CSV table of C-alpha atoms in Angstrom, one decimal:
chain,number,residue,atom,x,y,z
A,1,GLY,CA,11.4,3.1,-9.0
A,2,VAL,CA,9.7,1.5,-11.7
A,3,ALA,CA,6.5,3.0,-13.2
A,4,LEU,CA,3.5,0.5,-11.8
A,5,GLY,CA,0.1,0.9,-12.8
A,6,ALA,CA,-0.6,2.8,-9.7
A,7,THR,CA,1.9,3.9,-6.4
A,8,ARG,CA,-1.3,2.2,-4.2
A,9,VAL,CA,-3.3,-0.9,-5.2
A,10,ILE,CA,-6.8,-2.3,-3.7
A,11,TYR,CA,-8.6,-5.8,-3.8
A,12,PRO,CA,-12.3,-4.6,-3.1
A,13,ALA,CA,-13.8,-8.1,-2.5
A,14,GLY,CA,-11.5,-9.2,-5.9
A,15,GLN,CA,-13.2,-12.6,-5.6
A,16,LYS,CA,-11.3,-13.7,-8.9
A,17,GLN,CA,-8.3,-11.6,-9.5
A,18,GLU,CA,-7.4,-8.2,-10.1
A,19,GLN,CA,-4.6,-6.5,-12.2
A,20,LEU,CA,-1.5,-3.9,-11.8
A,21,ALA,CA,0.2,-2.6,-14.6
A,22,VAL,CA,4.0,-2.3,-14.9
A,23,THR,CA,6.0,0.3,-16.9
A,24,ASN,CA,9.3,1.7,-16.9
A,25,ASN,CA,10.3,5.5,-17.1
A,26,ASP,CA,13.7,5.0,-19.4
A,27,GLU,CA,13.6,3.0,-22.4
A,28,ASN,CA,17.0,1.5,-22.9
A,29,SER,CA,17.2,-0.8,-19.7
A,30,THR,CA,15.1,-4.3,-19.5
A,31,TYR,CA,13.6,-5.0,-16.3
A,32,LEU,CA,12.9,-8.2,-14.4
A,33,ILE,CA,9.9,-7.9,-12.2
A,34,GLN,CA,9.7,-10.2,-9.3
A,35,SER,CA,6.6,-9.7,-7.5
A,36,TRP,CA,5.9,-11.3,-4.1
A,37,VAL,CA,3.1,-10.4,-1.4
A,38,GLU,CA,3.8,-10.4,2.2
A,39,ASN,CA,1.4,-10.8,5.5
A,40,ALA,CA,2.0,-7.4,6.6
A,41,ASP,CA,5.1,-8.5,7.9
A,42,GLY,CA,7.2,-8.4,5.1
A,43,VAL,CA,7.5,-12.2,5.5
A,44,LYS,CA,6.6,-13.4,1.9
A,45,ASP,CA,3.7,-15.8,2.3
A,46,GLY,CA,1.6,-17.2,-0.4
A,47,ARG,CA,-1.7,-16.0,1.0
A,48,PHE,CA,-1.5,-14.1,-2.2
A,49,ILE,CA,-0.1,-15.2,-5.6
A,50,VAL,CA,0.7,-13.1,-8.7
A,51,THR,CA,0.5,-14.2,-12.1
A,52,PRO,CA,2.8,-13.7,-14.0
A,53,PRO,CA,4.6,-13.2,-10.7
A,54,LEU,CA,7.9,-13.4,-12.3
A,55,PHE,CA,9.0,-12.1,-16.1
A,56,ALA,CA,11.4,-10.0,-17.9
A,57,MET,CA,9.9,-7.2,-20.2
A,58,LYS,CA,11.9,-4.2,-22.2
A,59,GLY,CA,11.5,-1.3,-19.5
A,60,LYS,CA,9.3,1.0,-21.9
A,61,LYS,CA,6.3,-1.7,-22.5
A,62,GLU,CA,3.7,-2.7,-20.4
A,63,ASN,CA,3.1,-5.8,-18.7
A,64,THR,CA,0.4,-6.2,-16.5
A,65,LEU,CA,0.5,-8.4,-13.3
A,66,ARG,CA,-2.7,-10.1,-12.1
A,67,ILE,CA,-2.9,-10.8,-8.6
A,68,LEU,CA,-5.5,-13.3,-7.3
A,69,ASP,CA,-7.1,-15.3,-4.2
A,70,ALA,CA,-4.9,-17.7,-2.7
A,71,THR,CA,-5.8,-16.7,1.1
A,72,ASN,CA,-8.6,-19.2,2.2
A,73,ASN,CA,-6.8,-19.2,5.3
A,74,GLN,CA,-9.6,-18.0,7.8
A,75,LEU,CA,-8.9,-14.2,7.6
A,76,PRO,CA,-10.8,-12.0,10.0
A,77,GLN,CA,-14.2,-10.7,9.5
A,78,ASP,CA,-14.1,-8.4,12.8
A,79,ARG,CA,-11.4,-6.4,11.1
A,80,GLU,CA,-10.0,-6.4,7.5
A,81,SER,CA,-6.5,-7.3,6.3
A,82,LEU,CA,-3.6,-5.5,4.8
A,83,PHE,CA,-0.7,-7.1,2.4
A,84,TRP,CA,2.3,-5.7,1.0
A,85,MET,CA,2.8,-6.1,-2.5
A,86,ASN,CA,6.6,-6.2,-3.1
A,87,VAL,CA,8.2,-6.2,-6.4
A,88,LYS,CA,12.0,-6.6,-6.7
A,89,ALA,CA,12.3,-4.9,-10.2
A,90,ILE,CA,16.1,-5.4,-11.3
A,91,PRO,CA,17.1,-3.5,-14.3
A,92,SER,CA,18.2,-6.9,-16.1
A,93,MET,CA,19.3,-9.3,-13.3
A,94,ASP,CA,22.2,-10.4,-15.0
A,95,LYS,CA,25.2,-11.0,-12.4
A,96,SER,CA,22.9,-13.7,-10.0
A,97,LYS,CA,24.3,-17.2,-11.2
A,98,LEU,CA,26.4,-18.3,-8.5
A,99,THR,CA,28.5,-14.6,-8.4
A,100,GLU,CA,28.3,-14.0,-4.6
A,101,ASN,CA,25.0,-12.7,-3.2
A,102,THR,CA,25.5,-8.9,-3.3
A,103,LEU,CA,23.9,-7.9,-6.4
A,104,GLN,CA,22.6,-4.1,-5.4
A,105,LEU,CA,20.8,-4.0,-8.7
A,106,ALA,CA,17.1,-4.6,-7.4
A,107,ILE,CA,14.8,-1.3,-7.7
A,108,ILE,CA,12.5,-2.6,-5.0
A,109,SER,CA,9.6,-0.7,-5.5
A,110,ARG,CA,7.4,-1.8,-2.3
A,111,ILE,CA,4.0,-1.3,-2.8
A,112,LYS,CA,1.1,-1.7,-0.4
A,113,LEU,CA,-2.2,-3.6,-1.1
A,114,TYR,CA,-5.6,-3.8,0.6
A,115,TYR,CA,-7.6,-6.6,1.0
A,116,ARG,CA,-11.4,-5.8,2.0
A,117,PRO,CA,-14.4,-8.2,1.4
A,118,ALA,CA,-16.3,-5.2,2.7
A,119,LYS,CA,-18.5,-7.3,5.2
A,120,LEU,CA,-17.6,-5.5,8.3
A,121,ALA,CA,-20.6,-3.2,9.5
A,122,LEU,CA,-18.1,-0.2,9.4
A,123,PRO,CA,-19.3,2.5,6.9
A,124,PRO,CA,-16.5,2.8,4.9
A,125,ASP,CA,-17.2,6.4,3.6
A,126,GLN,CA,-17.0,7.5,7.6
A,127,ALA,CA,-13.6,5.2,7.9
A,128,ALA,CA,-11.4,8.2,7.3
A,129,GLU,CA,-14.0,10.3,9.6
A,130,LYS,CA,-13.4,8.0,12.5
A,131,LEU,CA,-9.4,7.7,11.8
A,132,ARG,CA,-8.6,9.7,15.0
A,133,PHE,CA,-5.7,12.0,15.4
A,134,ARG,CA,-3.7,12.8,18.7
A,135,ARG,CA,-1.4,16.0,18.3
A,136,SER,CA,1.8,16.4,20.6
A,137,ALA,CA,4.6,19.1,20.8
A,138,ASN,CA,6.7,16.4,18.6
A,139,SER,CA,4.6,14.3,16.9
A,140,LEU,CA,1.1,13.4,15.3
A,141,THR,CA,-0.5,9.8,16.1
A,142,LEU,CA,-2.6,8.7,13.5
A,143,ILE,CA,-5.1,6.6,15.4
A,144,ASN,CA,-6.7,3.2,13.2
A,145,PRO,CA,-7.9,1.2,16.0
A,146,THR,CA,-11.0,0.6,13.5
A,147,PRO,CA,-11.4,-2.6,11.6
A,148,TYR,CA,-11.4,-0.8,8.1
A,149,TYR,CA,-8.0,0.4,6.6
A,150,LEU,CA,-7.8,3.8,4.7
A,151,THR,CA,-4.7,5.7,3.6
A,152,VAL,CA,-4.3,9.5,4.8
A,153,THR,CA,-2.4,11.2,2.2
A,154,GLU,CA,-0.9,14.8,2.7
A,155,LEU,CA,-2.3,15.5,6.3
A,156,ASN,CA,-2.5,19.2,7.1
A,157,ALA,CA,-2.7,19.7,11.0
A,158,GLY,CA,-3.0,23.3,12.1
A,159,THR,CA,-0.1,25.4,10.9
A,160,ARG,CA,1.6,22.5,9.5
A,161,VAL,CA,1.6,20.2,6.2
A,162,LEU,CA,2.9,16.7,6.6
A,163,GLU,CA,3.7,13.3,5.0
A,164,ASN,CA,1.7,10.3,3.6
A,165,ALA,CA,1.3,7.9,5.5
A,166,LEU,CA,-0.3,4.2,5.9
A,167,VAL,CA,-2.4,2.3,8.5
A,168,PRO,CA,-1.3,-0.2,10.4
A,169,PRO,CA,-4.0,-3.0,11.1
A,170,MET,CA,-6.3,-2.0,14.2
A,171,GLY,CA,-3.5,0.2,15.4
A,172,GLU,CA,-1.7,3.7,15.6
A,173,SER,CA,0.9,5.2,13.4
A,174,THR,CA,2.9,8.3,13.8
A,175,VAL,CA,4.1,11.5,11.7
A,176,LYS,CA,6.3,14.1,12.4
A,177,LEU,CA,4.9,17.2,14.1
A,178,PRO,CA,5.9,20.7,15.1
A,179,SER,CA,5.7,22.1,18.7
A,180,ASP,CA,2.9,24.4,17.4
A,181,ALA,CA,0.2,22.5,15.3
A,182,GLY,CA,-3.4,24.2,15.6
A,183,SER,CA,-6.3,22.2,16.3
A,184,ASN,CA,-7.7,21.8,12.8
A,185,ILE,CA,-6.9,18.7,11.0
A,186,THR,CA,-7.5,17.7,7.3
A,187,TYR,CA,-6.4,15.4,4.8
A,188,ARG,CA,-7.0,13.5,1.7
A,189,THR,CA,-7.5,9.9,1.8
A,190,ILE,CA,-7.5,7.1,-0.9
A,191,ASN,CA,-11.1,5.4,-1.4
A,192,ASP,CA,-11.5,1.8,-2.4
A,193,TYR,CA,-11.5,2.6,-6.4
A,194,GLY,CA,-8.2,4.4,-5.7
A,195,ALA,CA,-9.6,7.4,-5.7
A,196,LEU,CA,-7.7,10.1,-4.1
A,197,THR,CA,-10.2,12.4,-2.3
A,198,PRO,CA,-11.1,16.1,-2.5
A,199,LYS,CA,-9.6,18.0,0.5
A,200,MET,CA,-11.7,16.6,3.4
A,201,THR,CA,-11.8,17.6,7.0
A,202,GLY,CA,-10.1,15.4,9.7
A,203,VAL,CA,-11.0,14.3,13.3
A,204,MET,CA,-8.4,14.7,16.2
A,205,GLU,CA,-9.5,13.9,19.8
């Protein structure tokens, strides 16, 4: 819920500030966008700040967020970094001035944000071609123990078609797989421009 400029956002050596639009589907309801960024842990750490981080707008409008460098914290270079760019978007946050703490109204849009100064020696086109896969009679583990982080969208594994997933940092994720799943894997990915790729082949081992 809420129609932000994208469903996924990238900071390719943003080295100033980037942007993310906000719009709505409905045109009656007003919204209160309340961005915060999180250290992949869902802890809100001001390693990123947003500007305006906090606004109301009328739902059918645009109001862009800009998202700017507040890291400076000795981020790694032997691997990259991943953020969650959470937005509580309340369709008008009335009934939150000391009236209990149980206002359900919160379309938390929960977006993901990549960081990459891209100063790793890993060739970023091949990042998706060294994301390994391990198939089982229940699961398909995504294997991103690589330093770079790329998205895998619409994973096809043998005789089955699977969900979108996101990459954990230098680690493995899992999606559902049947007790059939042939030895072909293919997928689309999100490259650093937000370019959802053509159908590309994929790399189990």
